[PDB]
Design a binder for this molecule. Structure first.
Ligand SMILES: O=C(Cc1cccc(OC(F)(F)F)c1)Nc1ccc(CCCCc2nnc(NC(=O)Cc3ccccn3)s2)nn1
Length: 311
């Protein structure tokens, strides 16, 4: 599957799109915790990792930042990989909401990409062991996805996220009341694990390798290791396609047509199946919560290389 005939000319076009996006100065850096409000609005990085293992970065691609919602497709993939589609979707829905409600009509969170869904997915991983082992288990998994490149942890983000996460505690108690967790779940402990996962740190470079693992049918392109089952990958990409960009998800599926997942740190994890993974990062967000520069870049990328799913 050679739709990138000349990698060096392709990176030349990446750089031009990078420079064009750089001029987009709009948006607001998230500031509900100090660990996000700190970030400069001018940070802007794009990293590419093909399914071959070819790499290209431009801009601020080695500055660590928190995954935040970008971790949601990754922990869903781990859950499906270990437990199968059917078991996971006993607890969480499979489609966009069209949203302030915690649960759909079946008393399940709408999908794994919204907070209530990610909290339920978190309760499914490595059940029975304590939180330190749960975290270590997911960390080892993310190391394999990233081919052992930068995966860190921001204790300061974790502490601030947990102390100000009233909406997530409201979701936690509502899900407990509607019996959404597996039997024996310690809800407060699940919220802790959830806040920790949101505080895992990557760079553009390490994250693009994670995305490239999803683009490569579950095989890490820079180690050849099998990390995720084909089922886990397929499921994760479908939900990223339809639910990955908050309230912009429907527009993004229509105009861009690639599986992607945004996050409040300004990251956009982007997958071009069978071609490449990308991570774009610029902290200033539009009013729907997506990185202004990243969105502009994603539109330009598809209008240039015919990467749209139905192109
Ligand atoms: O009940 C379900 C299935 C369901 C599916 C579809 C329709 C439906 O009927 C309903 F919309 F009327 F509820 C119910 N899910 C569910 C129900 C309750 C909850 C916990 C509560 C969610 C958090 C909120 N609390 N108050 C709110 N008020 C507003 O947002 C203000 C507003 C503005 C505009 C129009 C209406 N209100 S949000 N979480 N999830």
């Amino acid at each position: 599957g050679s739709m990138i005939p000349d990698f060096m000319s392709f990176t030349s076009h990446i750089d031009e799109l990078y420079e064009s996006a750089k001029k987009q100065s709009g948006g607001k850096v998230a500031d509900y915790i100090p660990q996000l409000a700190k970030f400069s609005p001018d940070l802007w990085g794009v990293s590419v990792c093909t399914v071959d293992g070819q790499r290209h970065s431009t801009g601020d691609t080695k500055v660590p930042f928190c995954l935040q919602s970008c971790v949601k497709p990754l922990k869903y993939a781990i859950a499906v990989n270990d437990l199968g589609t059917e078991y996971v979707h006993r607890y969480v829905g499979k489609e966009p909401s069209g949203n302030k409600l915690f649960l759909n009509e079946d008393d399940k969170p709408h999908n794994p990409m919204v907070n209530a869904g990610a909290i339920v997915v978190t309760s499914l991983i490595k059940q029975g062991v304590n939180n330190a082992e749960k975290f270590d288990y997911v960390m080892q998994f993310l190391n394999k996805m990233a081919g052992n490149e930068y995966v860190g942890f921001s204790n300061a983000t974790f502490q601030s996220e947990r102390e100000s996460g009233d909406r997530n505690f409201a979701i936690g108690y509502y899900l407990k009341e509607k019996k959404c967790f597996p039997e024996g779940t310690d809800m407060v402990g699940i919220l802790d694990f959830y806040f920790q996962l949101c505080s895992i740190e990557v760079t553009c470079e390490s994250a693009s390798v994670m995305a490239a693992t999803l683009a490569n049918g579950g095989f890490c392109p820079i180690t050849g290791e099998r990390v995720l089952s084909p089922e886990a990958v397929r499921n994760t990409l479908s939900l990223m396609h339809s639910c990955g960009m908050y309230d912009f998800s429907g527009q993004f599926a229509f105009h861009v047509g690639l599986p992607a997942k945004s996050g409040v740190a300004g990251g956009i994890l982007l997958v071009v199946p069978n071609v490449m993974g990308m991570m774009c990062w610029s902290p200033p967000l539009d009013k729907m919560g997506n990185s202004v520069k990243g969105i502009h870049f994603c539109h330009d990328l598809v209008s240039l290389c015919n990467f749209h799913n139905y192109d």
